[PDB]
Design a protein around this ligand. Structure first.
Ligand SMILES: O=N[O-]
Ligand SMILES: O=N[O-]
Ligand SMILES: O=N[O-]
Ligand SMILES: O=N[O-]
Ligand SMILES: O=N[O-]
Ligand SMILES: O=N[O-]
Ligand SMILES: O=N[O-]
Ligand SMILES: O=N[O-]
Ligand SMILES: O=N[O-]
Ligand SMILES: O=N[O-]
Ligand SMILES: O=N[O-]
Ligand SMILES: O=N[O-]
Ligand SMILES: O=N[O-]
Ligand SMILES: O=N[O-]
Ligand SMILES: O=N[O-]
Ligand SMILES: O=N[O-]
Ligand SMILES: O=N[O-]
Ligand SMILES: O=N[O-]
Ligand SMILES: [Cu+2]
Ligand SMILES: [Cu+2]
Ligand SMILES: [Cu+2]
Ligand SMILES: [Cu+2]
Ligand SMILES: [Cu+2]
Ligand SMILES: [Cu+2]
Lengths: 334, 334, 334
C-alpha cells in the first residue's frame, strides 16, 4: 500500500476569482489532496437585461472553483450530486490520465456521490468539465467547467530557469453561453431541461455565443468585485475556456510571462500583448504591475469583450510613473 | 544532371487514417520519391442522416492520403484527372517553394495528367490542397486536401534533442463542410457543379460549417474503424485542417510532445491538454499511452466535436494502472 | 530632468503597406521619437461592388501607419482630431504601460489635440487602436487601428541569437468589417453615425464579418499595388489584426522565422506554413525569397481570403530554380 502511507490534506475551496490557499514551492512530499464539490443546478442572471438561464455548476459558481495541487500529488475528489438536481453529471479532468479524464468513472445521478482519485503527473493549469455521454457541450456551455492548477514542486520558473513567484493569483473562467433565440431574436425560456434540449442544440450549432462572460455574468469582475493589485505586485491570472478560443489581454499592461496553453514544463512566452487560449484549455499569465489606476482585462475580440460580456477590471493602487507614461499636452482646442 | 543520378523510390499510398510505410531515420541518401494520385469527384454521405455531397478528392478519400518523405528528398507527383471528372483541378503543396506551391504548374482538365517535382527543403507536416484560380475555397471545402510529412533525416527529436520514435502513426484530416441550406434549414442538393456554385459561395460566406468531420464523415473513426493502440505504445497523430482552425484534444490523455503548427526544427510543446492548429496547417502530437480503454480524440470546441462531427475514438488494450487513476468510491446513493 | 536631455527625432510617417525609414540596429542612444497623426473620418469603398462605409482612420489610411522605434525610446505622439470630424477619439498603444495604453489620457473631441508620451519598454510589434469608452469595437472595426514596431536596440535575432536583417519590410493591416445587412442580405447605409450605431452593434454581434481586407479594401495589395521583392531578398511582413484572429500564409513560400504573437524577446518559430495571429495582436514573419513569380499572401481561412477579401500579392523578380521546383511533365492529355 503506497498511497495509504501518504499524508492527506483536506482543501476547502473558495469562489472564483479567488483561489484557495496553497504554497508555490511544495513544503511537503507528495500528498493525497482531498477536495469535495457539490453540483448545483440553479437559475443564473447573466446580463444587465435580466436574461436568466439554468446553469449547471460545480460548487455553485460559474466557473467552478480552481483546485491547486503539486505535480505527483494525488487528487481525490468527492463529487456529490444532490437529489435536488434533475440531471446526471460527471467530471473530466484534463490533468488526469485514463477513463476519459475521469468521466467514465464519475457518472452520478441525482442523489448519488462518488470519489475519484488520480495522480497529477503533469504540471500546468488544466480544464475540468462535466461530460455526460451524448450531452457534453450542453453541460459545458451551461457553465459546468472550471480548472485545476498542478504546480511544479519547485514552483514556477521563467525562460531561463529562474524562479517566478506570484504575490496574488486570480482565476478567470470565461463562459460562452448559447441562449436560444426565436426568429425575432429574443431569448427563449423553457419549462424543463428535456423541453429545452433540442433548441439548446440548435442554438449551439450556430457556433455563435449570445453571451461570453467572466465569472458567470456580464460585469461580474467590476465595481465592488473588480480584481485588485498594487504597483510592484506580481500577479498570476489563470484563464480557462472549456469550449471556445479566447485571446486575453490586459489593457494598459502585458503578460510578462505567458503559458498560453498552460503547461509549465515549457518556457513562457515573454512580453505578450495578447495570447490565444484554445477552447478546451487553461492558460496562465504573470504580470508585475508598474502603474496604478483602472485596467480592463478582456478577450481581445472587442465585440466579444464589450458587447457580449468578456471584460473585467483591475483596480491598482500606488504611485504613477511619469517616465513610463505621461500626458505631455492634455486634450485641448486646436 | 544531379537529380537523374539519385535513387528513385515509388510509394504506394494508403487510405487515411493509415500511413504508407516509411523509415523515421533515413536509411538512404536523398531520393526522388515518386507518388501518383488520381483525382476523384464522387458522392459522399457525410452524416448519420444521409446527407450527400459532391466531394472532390485526391485518391478517393477525404482527406487525401498522407505522403511521407525526408528533408531534401524530391517529391515527384504524377497527378491524374480522369475524363470521368467534370472540373479542372491542381495541387498546392505547403511543403514546396515556388509557383503557388505547385498550383500554377499543375492545372489539369478532365482527361489530363501532369508531373510536378519539388525539393522538400523544410521538415514538418504540411497541408496540400487543390487551388484552382477563382474557386479555391470551394475545392478545399469539398474535401480536396491532405498532408505531407517531411521527416528530418535523423528522425524526430524532443525539446532536449533526444530521439522521439513513434511505434504507430495516424493521419486525422479534419474537414469543414458548408452544405447549402434553404431558409427552413434543410440542405439543398444540386444538379450540376455550375448550378451549385453560387449557393456554395453563399454557404461558405456564413463562415459557419454545417459539418466538421474526421476522415470524411461523422463517426468515420469509430466502431470497427476506431484508431487502436496498446498501453506503452508511442503514437504520432498528424492532424490537418486546410481551411479553419481546430483545437485537438485526446480525452483521457495528452499531447506529450506537440508541434502545434507542425514544423520539426522547433522544439515541441510539452504536456499539452489541447493545442491550436490554425486553418491552413498540419500539426503533430506524440503520446505514449498509459491506460487502456476507450479514448475520444476531438476538436475541443465540443459543439464542433459532438454536434458537428469532429470526434473519433481510440481503443487501447492493456493493463489498468490504479496508481494513475482509480474509483475510490463508485457512484452510489447519498 | 532626464527626458529633456535626450535627442528628439521627428518621424514623417508613410502610408501602409510601406514603412517609414529607420535603422534596425540603433545608431544612437535612446531618443524621444516624435510622431504626429491626424484622425480622419472618411468614406471608403471597400469592395469591387462599390460598398461604401464610413471609416475612422489614423492618418487617412486603413490600417493606420506603422510607427517604428527602438526599445527604451520614448514615443511622443501628437494626436489631432480636426473639427471636420464628428466623433470623439483616442488612442491605446498595446506597446505602452498605464492608463489603458494611453486611451484614458488621449480623449480628443473634434477640434482638439493632445500629446502623449510613453516609454517603449518591450520589444515587438504591437497593435494600436482607438478605444472610446462604450464604443470601442465600433471604432476599431471602422478601421481605427494600426501597429507600432519596437525593435531591440541590436536588431532582430534568430533562435540561436544570430542576426536577422531584413532588406525590405511591409505592414499588412487586416480589417474585419461588419457592414449592416437587411433581412434580404443587402448592405444598409446610414445618414449619421448616431443613426448607424445600433445596427453597427447588431452587425458586430453576429461575429461574422462581411468583409476582411488588407490595406483597407478588396484587392488593395494587388495589381499596381502588389508587394514586390527579388529572389534572394530578405523580407519582414508585419501583420496586425486588432479585433479578430487571422492565420497568415505566403502561397508558394513560408515564414522562415515567425514571431506569431509578435514579441522579439522570444525565439521565432521556424519554417512555418501558416501561423495564428490572435485578434488584438501584431505578428511578424521573415522570409528569404527563393523563386520568382507571383505569390499570394492570405489569411488561410480561404473563404476569408478569396471570398471576403483577405488576400494580397507579391510580384517577385529573378531567376527560377528548377532544383527547388519544376514541371517534369506539363499538363497534357492522358
Ligand atoms: O445595460 N447596459 O447597456
Ligand atoms: O509516477 N508515475 O506516473
Ligand atoms: O517572493 N519572493 O520572490
Ligand atoms: O472559435 N473558437 O473555438
Ligand atoms: O487594449 N485595448 O483593447
Ligand atoms: O503550454 N505552454 O504554455
Ligand atoms: O443519428 N444520431 O443522432
Ligand atoms: O538545397 N537547397 O535548397
Ligand atoms: O524504438 N526505439 O526507441
Ligand atoms: O476559425 N477558424 O478559421
Ligand atoms: O476532455 N473532454 O472534453
Ligand atoms: O511549428 N512548430 O510546431
Ligand atoms: O467583382 N468580382 O467578382
Ligand atoms: O526603464 N524602466 O522602465
Ligand atoms: O545585411 N546584412 O546582413
Ligand atoms: O475568431 N477570432 O476572433
Ligand atoms: O496555399 N494556398 O492556400
Ligand atoms: O511573441 N512571440 O512571438
Ligand atoms: Cu453536468
Ligand atoms: Cu475536455
Ligand atoms: Cu480541385
Ligand atoms: Cu494553402
Ligand atoms: Cu475613434
Ligand atoms: Cu487593445
Amino acid at each position: 500500500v503506497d498511497i495509504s502511507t501518504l499524508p492527506r490534506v483536506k482543501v476547502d475551496l473558495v469562489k472564483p476569482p479567488f483561489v484557495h490557499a496553497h504554497d508555490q514551492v511544495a513544503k511537503t512530499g507528495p500528498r493525497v489532496v482531498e477536495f469535495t464539490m457539490t453540483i448545483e443546478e440553479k437559475k443564473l442572471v447573466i446580463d444587465r437585461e435580466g436574461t436568466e438561464i439554468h446553469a449547471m455548476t460545480f460548487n455553485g459558481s460559474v466557473p467552478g472553483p480552481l483546485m491547486v495541487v503539486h505535480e505527483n500529488d494525488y487528487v481525490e475528489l468527492r463529487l456529490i450530486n444532490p437529489d435536488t438536481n434533475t440531471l446526471l453529471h460527471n467530471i473530466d479532468f484534463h490533468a488526469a490520465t485514463g477513463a476519459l479524464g475521469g468521466g467514465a468513472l464519475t457518472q452520478v445521478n441525482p442523489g448519488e456521490e462518488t470519489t475519484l482519485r488520480f495522480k497529477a503527473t503533469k504540471p500546468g493549469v488544466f480544464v475540468y468539465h462535466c461530460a455526460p455521454e451524448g450531452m457534453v457541450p450542453w453541460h459545458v456551455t451551461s457553465g459546468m467547467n472550471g480548472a485545476i492548477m498542478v504546480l511544479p514542486r519547485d514552483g514556477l520558473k521563467d525562460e531561463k530557469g529562474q524562479p517566478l513567484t506570484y504575490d496574488k493569483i486570480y482565476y478567470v473562467g470565461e463562459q460562452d453561453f448559447y441562449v436560444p433565440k426565436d426568429e425575432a431574436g429574443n431569448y427563449k425560456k423553457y419549462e424543463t431541461p428535456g423541453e429545452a434540449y433540442e433548441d439548446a442544440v440548435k442554438a449551439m450549432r450556430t457556433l455563435t455565443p449570445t453571451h461570453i462572460v467572466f465569472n458567470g455574468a456580464v460585469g461580474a469582475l467590476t465595481g465592488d468585485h473588480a480584481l485588485t493589485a498594487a504597483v510592484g505586485e506580481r500577479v498570476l491570472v489563470v484563464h480557462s475556456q472549456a469550449n471556445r478560443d479566447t485571446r486575453p489581454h490586459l489593457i494598459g499592461g502585458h503578460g510578462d510571462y505567458v503559458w498560453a496553453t498552460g503547461k509549465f514544463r515549457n518556457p513562457p512566452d515573454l512580453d505578450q500583448e495578447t495570447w490565444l487560449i484554445p477552447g478546451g484549455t487553461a492558460g496562465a499569465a504573470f504580470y508585475t504591475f508598474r502603474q496604478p489606476g483602472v485596467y480592463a482585462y478582456v478577450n481581445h475580440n472587442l465585440i466579444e469583450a464589450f458587447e457580449l460580456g468578456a471584460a473585467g477590471h483591475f483596480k491598482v493602487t500606488g504611485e504613477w510613473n511619469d517616465d513610463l507614461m505621461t500626458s505631455v499636452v492634455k486634450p485641448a482646442s486646436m
